[PDB]
Amino acid sequence: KVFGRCELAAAMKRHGLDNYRGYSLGNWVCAAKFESNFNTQATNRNTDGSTDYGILQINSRWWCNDGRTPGSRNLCNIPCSALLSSDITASVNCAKKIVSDGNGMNAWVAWRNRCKGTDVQAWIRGCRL
Numbered sequence: 001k002v003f004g005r006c007e008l009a010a011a012m013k014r015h016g017l018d019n020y021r022g023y024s025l026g027n028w029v030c031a032a033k034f035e036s037n038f039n040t041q042a043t044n045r046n047t048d049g050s051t052d053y054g055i056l057q058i059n060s061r062w063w064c065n066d067g068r069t070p071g072s073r074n075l076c077n078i079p080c081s082a083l084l085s086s087d088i089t090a091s092v093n094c095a096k097k098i099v100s101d102g103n104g105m106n107a108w109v110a111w112r113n114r115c116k117g118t119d120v121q122a123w124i125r126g127c128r129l
């Protein structure tokens with residue numbers, strides 16, 4: 001599923017991401033924009049052989065099981081495929097665990113490089129939330 005901008009903001013809010021660990025909804029929408037262009041089915045292989053999955057490009061190295069990332073963990077206790085569903089529940093629950101992990105949203109390199117410090121409120125502007 002390719003979400004609309006306000007559509008995703010709404011879904012993220014419903015699943016409790018808005019201001020989770022102090023990160024406003026706009027941060028999460030901006031992160032999803034540059035990670036996946038709002039596409040739940042996005043996948044990208046990393047140089048190390050792990051793969052990033054879903055709207056927030058969650059990595060098999062630590063967070064999900066894909067059966068093909070040697071030495072990896074599955075800290076969200078899910079198959080990586082659950083992160084590609086049109087229902088964003090698994091991605092949000094896993095993102096909550098990731099952002100609690102110590103480095104906040106810097107865990108997402110695209111957020112650090114393209115969203116951090118910017119006017120992230122623009123991402124939810126005009127949305128009936």
Ligand SMILES: NC(=[NH2+])NCCC[C@H](N)C(=O)O
Pocket residue numbers: 059062098101107
């Ligand atoms: N959120 C991340 N993927 N961070 C990268 C390092 C992972 C971190 N050492 C951990 O607790 O698994």
Ligand SMILES: NC(=[NH2+])NCCC[C@H](N)C(=O)O
Pocket residue numbers: 119122123
């Ligand atoms: N070149 C870019 N990546 N621009 C993204 C900024 C989008 C802007 N915050 C908006 O939603 O209207």
Ligand SMILES: [Cl-]
Pocket residue numbers: 005
């Ligand atoms: Cl957009």
Ligand SMILES: [Cl-]
Pocket residue numbers: 065066067068069070071072
């Ligand atoms: Cl594996």
Ligand SMILES: [Cl-]
Pocket residue numbers: 065066078079080
């Ligand atoms: Cl599995």
Ligand SMILES: [Cl-]
Pocket residue numbers: 021022103104105
């Ligand atoms: Cl933080």
